Write a structure and sequence with these properties.
By secondary structure, this protein is α/β, with parallel strands linked by helices. The protein has one domain (1-274): Rossmann fold (3-Layer(aba) Sandwich), CATH 3.40.50.1820. The protein is built from 10 helices and 7 strands. A 7-stranded mixed β-sheet has the order 1-3-2-4-5-6-7, with helices on both faces. Helix 2 (75-88) crosses helix 3 and helix 5 runs antiparallel to helix 6 (174-184). The relative contact order is 0.16. The structure holds sodium ion (3 copies). It is classed as hydrolase.
Length: 274
């Protein structure tokens, strides 16, 4: 076009910067939401930190200028793309806050460029949802197939079932409406392919290679993440770590229980493991 080079990758990530400081906080979001999931955290960071937010896992893919690039077929490709973001935006070190599988994309990226990560703060993280005989991820095959439900048959129907289950609490809540809203900003074919990536991804083998400090935070009552997952990550990471299980419900507690989750997140961002 006449305004310049069509930068479609740039458009998919939608990198936004707010605040200022010597340290950059990078905020990654989980499947079904976008950078707006951090609306209650960001106002309490901007005084002290530069904050970089970006979108991923097919977020905002109904925007007709969004293209689902081939890199986005795997979580490793998301990790690669995160490293490119860090390079392009001149991040020499950062505090990486990753919600859900973005905690793992951050972890994978940190194995490659540990120099770029001061620490990882994981929120509602899992290295794998599907159970094995020896690993409790929280899902049997029947659960995965139920949760998938009408995702490609009837997206609109699936979303009304999916959103309240993941978020927890009541259907009419601002959080469920927000999650539903962001789910509708996803092209249904892209939501389907990312859903399948999410539920077939097994990142447990990466954990031992992680060396940067990891703060491991989750809700006690998360339908997607048993309480034992936090301890699993804690026992297997290769560097310093700490766990904080919050007396909250839901997979998106930063959106649905900010009164409890925000103060916990801020403590883990601002204070280092000794
Ligand atoms: Na580091
Ligand atoms: Na350890
Ligand atoms: Na340790």
């Amino acid at each position: 076009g006449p305004l310049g080079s069509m930068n479609r990758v740039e458009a998919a990530r939608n990198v936004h910067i707010v605040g200022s400081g010597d340290t950059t906080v990078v905020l990654g979001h989980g499947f079904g939401t976008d950078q707006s999931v951090w609306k209650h955290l960001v106002p309490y960071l901007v005084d002290s930190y530069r904050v970089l937010l970006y979108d991923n896992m097919g977020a905002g893919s109904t925007n007709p200028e969004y293209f689902h690039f081939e890199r986005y077929s795997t979580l490793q490709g998301y990790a690669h793309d995160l490293l490119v973001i860090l390079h392009e935006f001149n991040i020499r070190s950062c505090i990486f806050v990753g919600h859900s599988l973005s905690a793992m994309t951050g972890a994978i990226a940190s194995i490659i460029r540990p120099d770029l990560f001061q620490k990882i703060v994981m929120l509602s993280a899992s290295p794998r949802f599907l159970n094995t005989a020896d690993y409790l991820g929280g899902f049997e095959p029947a659960d995965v197939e139920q949760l998938a439900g009408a995702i490609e048959a009837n997206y609109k129907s699936w979303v009304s079932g999916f959103a309240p289950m993941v978020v927890g609490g009541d259907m009419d809540s601002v959080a469920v409406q927000e999650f539903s809203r962001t789910l509708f900003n996803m092209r249904p074919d892209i939501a389907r392919s990312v859903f399948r990536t999410i539920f077939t991804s097994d990142l447990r083998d990466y954990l031992g290679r992680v060396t940067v400090p990891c703060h491991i935070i989750q809700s006690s009552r998360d339908m997607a993440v048993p309480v034992s997952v936090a301890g699993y990550i804690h026992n297997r990471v290769g560097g310093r770590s700490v766990v904080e299980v919050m007396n909250t419900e839901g997979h998106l507690p930063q959106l649905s229980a900010p009164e409890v989750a925000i103060p916990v997140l801020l403590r883990h961002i601002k204070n280092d493991i000794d």
